[PDB]
Structures are given as C-alpha cells and as structure tokens.
Amino acid sequence: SIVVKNNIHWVGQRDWEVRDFHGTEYKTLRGSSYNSYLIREEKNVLIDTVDHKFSREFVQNLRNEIDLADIDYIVINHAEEDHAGALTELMAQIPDTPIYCTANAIDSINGHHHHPEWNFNVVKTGDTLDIGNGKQLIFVETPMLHWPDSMMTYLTGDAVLFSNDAFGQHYCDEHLFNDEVDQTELFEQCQRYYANILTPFSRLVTPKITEILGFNLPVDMIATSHGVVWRDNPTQIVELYLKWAADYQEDRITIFYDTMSNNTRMMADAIAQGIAETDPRVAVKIFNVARSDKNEILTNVFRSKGVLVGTSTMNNVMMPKIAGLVEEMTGLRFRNKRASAFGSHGWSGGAVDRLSTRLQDAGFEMSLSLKAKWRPDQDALKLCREHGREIARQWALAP
Amino acid sequence: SIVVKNNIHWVGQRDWEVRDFHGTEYKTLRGSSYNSYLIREEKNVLIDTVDHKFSREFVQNLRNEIDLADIDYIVINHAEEDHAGALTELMAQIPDTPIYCTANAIDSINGHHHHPEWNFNVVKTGDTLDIGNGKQLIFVETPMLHWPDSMMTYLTGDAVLFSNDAFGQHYCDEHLFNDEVDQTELFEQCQRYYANILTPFSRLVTPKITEILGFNLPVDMIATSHGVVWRDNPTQIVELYLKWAADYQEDRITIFYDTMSNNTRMMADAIAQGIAETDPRVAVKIFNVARSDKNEILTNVFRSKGVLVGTSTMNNVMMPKIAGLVEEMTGLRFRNKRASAFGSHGWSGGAVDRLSTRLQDAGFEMSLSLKAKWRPDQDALKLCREHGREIARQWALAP
Amino acid sequence: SIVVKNNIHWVGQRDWEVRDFHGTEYKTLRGSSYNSYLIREEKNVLIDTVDHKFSREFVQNLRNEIDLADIDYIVINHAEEDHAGALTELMAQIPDTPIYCTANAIDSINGHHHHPEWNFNVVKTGDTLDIGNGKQLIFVETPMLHWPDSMMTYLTGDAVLFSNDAFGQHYCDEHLFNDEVDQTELFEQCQRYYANILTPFSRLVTPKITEILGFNLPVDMIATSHGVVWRDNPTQIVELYLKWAADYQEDRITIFYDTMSNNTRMMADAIAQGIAETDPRVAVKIFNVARSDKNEILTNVFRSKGVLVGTSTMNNVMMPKIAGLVEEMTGLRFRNKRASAFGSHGWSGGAVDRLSTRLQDAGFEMSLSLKAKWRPDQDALKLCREHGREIARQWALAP
C-alpha cells in the first residue's frame, strides 16, 4: 500500500505484463494498473477493487492493511471487471457489507457477479455518505462516461476526486503521482486512452465537467482508477479532456490502407508526397493496417483534420481489415473530419466506392475518391501525387 | 532443375520461409513453391516464371539450364506476381521473345510490368502452338479461375496439363511428385487453398472441367504452378475439385466469435455442449477470431453444414474482427449453409441483429439468434445449451 | 459432466481458446482440456481438478453433480497448476477432506497453495484405497514423469488407469473418447506433446511401463488429464510411448537457422537440394526460427536422424534465437542424433564454431561444419549443395 494523502491509502495493483484489454481491441504497450483506495476516518471505506486476475492478491493485501470486518462501506464507481473483478472474493469474507453504487451499477454488478442478495445502496448525484471527522463522500453520476453504471466519488476536506476511468491512463509505474513519472509517456498514454475509448462519449464530457465545477468543490487531487494520481496541477488533465472533447484535431492527415500486392501502398506513398510538397505545415502519417498497431492508427485519426483510407478490391468487396476498422470507426463517432477513399483494382473493382459510402456513413465529410488499375506506372503515380496536392489545398487551414 | 517427364524440366523455386500471401489474407504455414517449366523439343518453351522476390535467382538458374537466346516461346498462363514476377528481368535479356497468353493477360501483364511493346500473341481455347517432334501445346482459357487472365496449357504426346493455380497447393517440399510427399499434409494444404481462394468461383469449376474432359485428351500428369506435380493417379485432384465445387459440406458445425470479457465465449462453449449432447455425429470446432488462424476458420466454414457466429455489442456496433470476417465471407460466396448469430450485451445491444442481417446477405440461411445480457449465470447457460440442442435438431442430416 | 464408464464421471473443462502453455514455451494450436473425474461407489472420490483459470466454473459445475460435503477423498496425481489449480477454491468449501498424493506432492501442493494444514495422506506405489462395491484405487508413483510429484491411480474392477499427463495430448474436442475424434489430429497432438515435454524423461518411460504391466492389471481405459479418454484399443498409446522413448528417429533431416540478410537461408536451401538429390528416402524440412512455430521445429528434431543448424555471426556471437533453441535442446536431451553447424560471416566470424561446440555438448554427434563469407555466389552454392550430398551419404540408413 501507498499513502495518497492523510488517511487515504492506495491498495491497488500494478500490472507490468498486461498487453491486451477488451479482448485484443486495446493494446497496452506500457502495461496498466488498477487503483483501489481505502479511506480510514471514523468509518472505513473501500473505493473500487481491481482486475479479476488479481483477486487473490487483492484480498490478501487488503488483509495486510486492515481486518476485513473493519471495513464499513464499499463504493463501486463502475462495475467493469478491471475494477469490480475482486468483489466476489471480498464479499465472500464480508457478505453483509453495504455497497454504494448507481442504480445502473446494481444491474451491472449483478450482471457479472450474480449475488443480488448483497446489500446495495443506490446513490444519485449529490447524495452524501458521512465518514466522520468532518469528512464525507459526495457522489456524482456520470452515465456513459463510459458505461451506464459509471460515477465519481468526491471526498470533502481532503478534496480528492475519485474519478474511476475518467482522466486515467494505461501506464504502469511504481511511482503513484503524476509529477513522479516521465511526462511524455504519461501524456501519450492519456491521449491513446481518450482517442480509443472515450471519443464516442465526447458530447457528454463538457456538460459533466461543467456540472462538477459548478459544485464549487476544491480539487487538491484526482485519484483515477488507472495509472497516476494527479496531485501536481491536477486540473491539467481536466483541461486536456475539454480540448479533446471538442471534436479535437491538429493540422495532421493520417493515411491508412491494406494491400495484397502493394499497388494501394504505392498510391498511398504518392499521395503523401503530394501533401508534403504542397502544405509543409501538415504532419502526415501512413499505416498499413495489416502490419501496424491499430490503436496507434486510431489515435492518429483522432488527432487528424482528415484521413485517406485505401483498399484494393478483393472478391468484389473491401479488404477485411479495412471493413473491420470502418465498423470500429463508425462506433467511435469521429466528428468534423474529412476523408477520401482510394485503392487499386484488377477488372471491375467496386471496393473504393463501397468504402467511401461507409466512411460517409461514419460521419466523415467526403472528398473525391482516387482509383487506379493494377500497378500504377509513372503516369498514374503523377495522378496520385496530384490527388495529394489537391487534398492538401482543399483541407488547408487558414494562413 | 528437375526432370518432370522426357524433355520437360522443372525450373521453379521452393519457398520454405514464406508465411503470408495476398498481404496477410492467406497464411502459408507450410511455405509454398512457384513452378515454372522448360520444354525442350524442336522449339524451346518456357511455361510461367516465379515470384518477383526470386527474380534474380530465377534468371541465373535458367541460364544454368539453357542459353536465354535459345528460348523460342514464353507461355504466361496467369500474370499474378507469384508467377509472372520474374518476367521483366527475363524480358530485359531477351526483349523480342514472343509471349503467348490470353487477351485479358495482355491487360494484366501490362498492368504489372508496363512493357506494352513486348510481342504478345493472344491465344483462345483450342489454339495450338507446334513445338516439333509431333508435339504441340493446346491452350484452354479459364477466366475467373481465378483471374480474368487465367488459362491452362496442355502438351500433347507427353500428355501433361499445365494448370497453373488450379489443382495446386501451398506446400513446400524438395520432392516434386505427389506420391513422394506426406499425403495428409498435401491434402490439408489442397483443401485450405480451395476453401480460402476458389470458393467464390465454384460455379465455374464443373463447367470448365467438363469442357476439358470433352476434349478427349489423355492426362498422364497435372503440373500446377504451386506444390506437387500430380503424376500418380492425377485425376484424384480433379475429382476432389468436383466434390469441392458442389457447395461442399460435411456433418460439421463451426462456431466462431470475438469477445471483450469472455461472455460471448461462455455462450459459445454452452452452445457446443448442447450440440455434442444432441447429435454426436456432428464434428464441432470453436474459434476465437482474435486468437486463431483466420484461414483455418474459413476452411472449417467451407467444410461445415452451418455456422454460429458471435459478437458482443461494442459502441453500438459489432466487434471489428467479426465485421471484417463477415465482409470477407460475403466475397467468398458460401452456399447451402445455415447460420445463427449470438452474443452478449450490456444495455441496449444491437450487434447480434446487425450480424444476423449481414450473414443473411452473405448467403446463409438464418435460424433464430441467441442473446444474453452481461455474463450468463446458470439459468442463462442452460438457455445457451438448449440453443445448441435446438440448432443440432434443426440442422440434423437424415438418419 | 459426461459418463466415462459405470460410476466414473468426467467433470473436467474444455479449453478451446488456450494457445500458450508454460509461458509461451508450448503453443497449443488446437487448444487443450483439463480432465478431472468423480467416481461414485460406496465412497465418492474426486481425481484431480482443473486449470486455475477455470476454478470458479469447476466448483460450480461440481456442485451441480454432487453436494461438496459428500466427497470422501480427493486424489491429486500431480500438482501443476493445470490440474490442481482449482484446489484452493474447492478446499475452502470442504477444508477437512483428505487428500491422497505422493510425498513430493505435499511439497508441490504446499508450494503453490500454501495450506500445509490440509489433511494430506502420502501414498507409495502399491498402496490401496478402498471405495466399496469390491473396487479400490491402487497408486503408482511416477517421479519425473514429468515432475517429482507425479503418480497414476488405477481403479480395479472398472479397470481404468488415471494416468494424468502421461499418454495425454493438448487437443480440444467435445467428444471424450479416442474413437470419436479425428485420428490424424489426435496423433499429431500426441507426438508434439511427447517430443516437446517428455523427451528428456525418455529413460524413465520404459522401466515405468514395464513395472505397471508386471502388475498384471487389466486396462479397459486410460483416462488421462488432457484430451481424450483411451477406450478403443487403449494400449495403442502405450505402444507409441515405448517406440517414442527408445531414442526415436525416422529417415528424416531437419534444417533450421536464423539469418539477418538471407545468406544463411541460401546455404540452407542449397544443403536441402543436395540431400534430396542424393538420398530420396529422406524427408527434409527447413525452418527459419524467427518465422516458424518453435514447437513444430522441435517435433521435427525429435522425429529426425540428424539436424543442420545455421546462424550468421552477429557482434562476435550467435544469433540470439539460435542460442535460445540450443539451450532448450540441451535441456530436452535428444539422443542418437547427428548434427552439422553452418552459417555465413562478414569478416572474422566465429558463430559457427561456437554453435557446433554447443550442439556437441547437447548430445549431438557432430559432422563437419559449413562456412561461407557474405552472400554465396554460384561457386559457393555448389559447395553448399555438395555439403548436403556428403551429409546425406554419411547419415544414410542401411539399404
């Protein structure tokens, strides 16, 4: 365990090895951590647990900190298995202990653990739980940030916001605090997290932060459920989220494609050359989706004013990894971004139009598509470079 | 080089290392080979080249066999880069050498190599090229088996059918002939090849084989462009293709899914238990698409009377790898097969219906979907097992 | 659960998804299963549990079969986590239940579970446990097949040998019995298992099987801890093990290497051509260790009369993946096999001699090494082919 502040004790778990979250949909190249907190005032409160894979360790470690029967209340901000995953093993030892959570969390907790007999206590925004010594917890519902069950818990006096997933990041380090870790790595992990997980809930971010601030509660620390506790200039992460939620983009274009014989790759490289020659302000990145980290592609899309996506025609349809990434983007809801589809074909083609239609349906504002037959010769590569120049001109930011 | 028969010399390339074809769409776990043949009669004829990656070796090796200027004719059955990939380097040495190919192959050859000045000679089915000593080549067009440019070349007297991709397989071995290799491995590779590449052209297979047989030409050997030369009971591969083309299926069900927290996996396992208990005749296979070889999944689909496909709901859409595999299956055109969609959701769901509609559009005859919320408890697992029992009963073959 | 025979009930777990065992040292491309058996006579006996990852399911499923308090005895044949992994969760419900195991298993069980207070009962070979109705269990110690704690348990009357890891295989199927599954796949998985895991204990295999047979106990079934129950001609797997233990080899040579710029790959391919031309009886396989399944390489080594291993020189040492595989082979103890080291270098070299010395130390009988500088030209490739011809002649089996 590690002291957070006063009588707040981090009793979580670092996970150096973990490389896959949500099946294989989110790759954690710097591992992760699962933060749980024990507050010891007149009442003893446990905030969240840890991933199910560490259930045994979590309960044994908690015993080393406190006799389990001395825990008064358990707060579950969110019932995804990376936070409530040790709850069944803990509850087996202290079956009657009250659990405080949102109404939706009863559904999600029962959904995973199947113990509807536990003593649940529904909390709504503004509800309070007194823990003594002039301190209390104030609950704030945050539905769809990022699950229906989600909430945050604020501790008065100590002025700590327990934000669960919000403001967190998958970044394993033995140091608990934000000022103690490498800043470049920290912020890279924060942005990858927002881009890949929170983008579709962006419309909910500014209203919820606005609501919380209107409570006029001081924030000395933000203790999230993943990665660092924000204790040096904690509002920095809040301000980033406000920037990130507003249909964020930089002067940046991302190009990604799949290819069977490199023809669409040659088109992509020519497009990039045309962009770079025409508007040097623009940062350009190119990825082969079959050979690159998918989450890195999506973080780039999030950061970009526009994208070009490429596929050849394969059995009259799109290449499968491109079809999958377009499905995924549809669910992520990127906004205010432009796109252009491109690709090669051997005879009747069709995949480029099929792709451009799905990109439009995903919310991208479409420019003209670029098509070529078989392998582009010198003449065709010139047309590909010009497509890049024309896309750069059309998408250029104001001087 | 290796003697095929009489004056036919294999001058190809074995590829022990290759693991990816068509980008990463076809995984060659036993490597591959690229067969090219040099026939030396009164005229010298080269049939096909090899993959572009071995262009230097191919030309140097061919020089070891024959002075390049002594080659009279070049036959290109098919211009995909794994067979015509060394053509530019060869043609640079002997620029005026005549090339015999289909009309469509002029387009595809020019498409890849950009030398429209080469001396192309269009051949149609039944056209002949005399090479002396009472032998000649007879060309047979085979459009869309598997490209518009595809054809086969038959050599009279020696009675050898050069079938290019047809009847071939990706299976690297130093032994050239079918009777010289491991039979289980050979036939596994043949079926994986047909299932993953030729399924969508199945309707063309029986008419083309019927046409070729109606020529009343003896076949002593079938010399393909990948893997073994069929010289012991060569019609065995032809008969397999006739079986494979007729909307082939065995008494077999394939279950595949993706999952973020294992809920859909639990459903899949319960379904399988219900099937196995109800109809023991049925071979059942289960795959997590995020953790398994995709081509092996598709070979199983090809072999199956039906499939169950599973996904959870992720950001109101399907899991991406499932969306991609459904796109791919749509292009493959499986026929006479049944399906049932299944999966878990947390709140409003939607992915199962989205999946079932796309499976129907891909040609599967749909049975009822199976849905569950969060993690299935004992009661829900019973419903999943019963879904399996009911699917087994509905899809059962006649006693 | 599934009936094995009479009152023996399979209460295990199928694992369709698992792809890695022992870290990543053993890849299970066809999944696996964990077999546990409940015998219900006058006494109720549980034989083994399942992998720790399925602990919750195992106990819940066992409850569906029997009230936990009705279990009289628990037999633990082997305490590796894939079999005793659910023991802590089970013992928490029935703390006083007697456990029967070898002396060494007390050490290994306490080693993993840390409950030395459990009621252990040491069994030695020939000890018996009466379970009523004229049936009893007879224990047979099998130390280092494959752990110090290992044993088998034989059930009289029903004539079932519970062999735990021995005779098992990682092969997931819903059908329990050997006659119900695909035979090619079954035997492939059995051999991969023996080659990769049991080879170093081969010297113990023939004496232990000899001892068991000398008991004159009928064997109607062999119920292992992984994969199928052998009930049709069960001695078939026993006879295979006797063949496999006797320093098994076929007329087969395996070539494997790593390479930075393909020079050692070119040497390997030339060597193979020389072998194939010289002794057509020999099955040859070639693997790039950086691009191939390591367990498949080792299964081939096991099946081979000899191996050639290749590395270039990298920073005055061997390429790392080759150093690792030689370490692993040293621990596996291959016997009666021949080897030859080969590779390329740029200047002073040294890796080939370094490799040949380690192969000798691993137990291989060494033939001359083959060395080349940079990329082999035509002359050097001739020398590589001749090395193959000479190796084939030297290692040839009798006519």
Next chain:
Amino acid sequence: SIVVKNNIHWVGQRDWEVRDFHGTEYKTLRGSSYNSYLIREEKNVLIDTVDHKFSREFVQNLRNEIDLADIDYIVINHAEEDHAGALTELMAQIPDTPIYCTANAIDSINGHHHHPEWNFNVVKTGDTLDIGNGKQLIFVETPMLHWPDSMMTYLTGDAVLFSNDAFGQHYCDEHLFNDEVDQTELFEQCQRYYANILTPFSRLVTPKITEILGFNLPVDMIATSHGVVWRDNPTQIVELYLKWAADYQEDRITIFYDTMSNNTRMMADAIAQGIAETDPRVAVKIFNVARSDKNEILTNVFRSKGVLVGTSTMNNVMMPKIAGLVEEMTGLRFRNKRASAFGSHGWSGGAVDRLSTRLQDAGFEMSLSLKAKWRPDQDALKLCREHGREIARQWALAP
C-alpha cells in the same frame, strides 16, 4: 527528389511499412528511410543507393532526376544491403562508372553483388575527389562504425558531412530536416538505434569524432543514410553520441524475466516495490521477455545503472528466451553496469546460478542472486522486497 542544399539532391526512399531489420533482431516501429544523395557540380556524384527491395523504384526515380550516363562518380560509404542494395541494377545500366569506397568495401561489395569487374577506387582517410566549382569530397574511414567497410564523405564549401549509418535513426517522415519532425519521436528513435546497434563499438566513437573535429572542417549539415538531415544545430547529435559512448547510464534499473507459471514474475514485482520504496530517485521498468518488445528492453538496459534478470529452471537449464537475450547482451558489450540474477525452481534448480555466471561473463558486475522455491508466499515475498531494498541501497548514486 528533395533539395538538401544548393546542388545536393536527396534521391532516397521512405519506407513507412518496414517493421523488421536484421532478420527480426531490430524492430522499426516507426518505419525507416534510406537516404541517397546526388550532387551536381562540374562532376555529378551519387552518394549511396537504397535498400534492395526498392531497387526498381530507385533507378527509375534517378532517371527522372538525371540521365544515368551523366553520373561521373559513385560513392559507396557502406555496402550493407539497405544502402548498396540497388547497386547491381544501377551498374547494369552504367557498367563502367567508377566506384569510390574503402578497401574493405571492395570485399563487402563483391561479397553481396559478385561483380569484381566493376571499377573500384580505394579511398583512405584524407583522400580527396574534386567535383569542380571549388568543391571536393574528403573521405574519412570509420572501420567498425559499424562494419569494416564503413566510411563518411565530407563535401567542402557546402560543408555537408555524409555520415551514412552514424547519427541516423529509423524514423519515417515525409519531411527531410531535423527541425521539421516531432522532436520526442526523433530522439527516441536515435537512442533505440544507438543502444541496439552501436553499443558494442562505443570505444571507437570518441576517437573517431575527435579525429574528425581535428580536421577543422565546418559542418553546416549532417546528411545520414537513415532518417533526417541534421541542419538545425547539427552538432546536437554528435554531442549525444559522445555522451552515449561513455558507458552511458541514468539513475534507472531494468528488470526482465521469463516465467512459466508466474512465480518469477511475482518475485520481479516484489523486487520493484522494494527498490521504489527505498530510492525514489530510481526509474524502474519491468518486462516479461516473452511478451514485450526486445529492442525496448535493450534500450532500457543501455539507459540503466543496473539490471535484474529472472528465469525459472526448465529441464535443468535456463528458459530459452533468457538464454538468447544473454547471448545477445554478451555481443553488445554493456559496460559499467551492475546485475543480480533471480528466479524460482521446483526441486534441484540451477538456472539462476547458470544465468548469474553468464551475466558476469557478459561484463556485468554481479550482486547476490535471489532464489525462491515454487510460488512465493507472504514470507518469501517479504524476502523478495528486501532484496529490492538491498539492491537499491547498494547501487544508489551519491546524494
């Protein structure tokens, strides 16, 4: 092509897709590029070519820039295939063109291309080649930075140092200059490159840089063979190399291991906790070698004052991936670093001592090893944490 300065034209190749160099020994997660330069004064000089995979493109692109017959001289700084890989295709068009290179480069060029008839001109340090308009090239031999053939070429007047591999990095971007790319990414790639490739030649770095500076030649730009041209404060990369060569280390400890059942992982995590609690100045990183990027582990080792390496005992030897990484480290020659070996065992063990001996032989100054049996309980984890505390105290930097 892109203008570098005055009459110097970049005529290289960007490689967005490439992910593997030197087999799979160096992973390029941000791609790479191959820089070649054409200088057009009174004489026309080509400096280097590009990777063999882009040979066709390179020659076609060069034709677009200049008639091949107008090239006067070719300079080959280094004959590895990523730079001289297009030389055979270029030389086929202009066979008589003089090549300037080191004596050793004749051996390496002939080694790869097998055209000893080409007109080679040996250059030694200080030799000059006049190209007119008051400019000339001055050659500087740099043997073993990083091959025997390596050299740099300096262009007077324009004051550009063509350093080939030295000062380069694998970092693909359409922008050519150092001030035009993301600085964090650039410097990350520079350090990964030095750590993984140049560490063993560190002793040669300070003398060669000292020699070059003693020439009193102004340096306006450093045009390397990979990544950016250094044109803004170009000496920044030179100063980094001087820091990196001096047995570089930060206040940082790297822990890495392999594990079959997570016991050694538990030890590693406890060790890390002890370090972090004892000396908060120290940055700690932990990697499972079977699940992490190997080059990232080695970059961390390079940056570290010490390492702890972990393995269990497997068949009386070390786990193979650990044996391979120790072989690789032996060749890399890390200096002034401390180490401690650790790991778990089941019975007789031996792998930890085996590992500690090899680490000592690799140049690490050894502290005591840490050993545990099976899975560490609470008592054993305390000993592991204390090992961490004791290692932190011993290795602490001065206050």
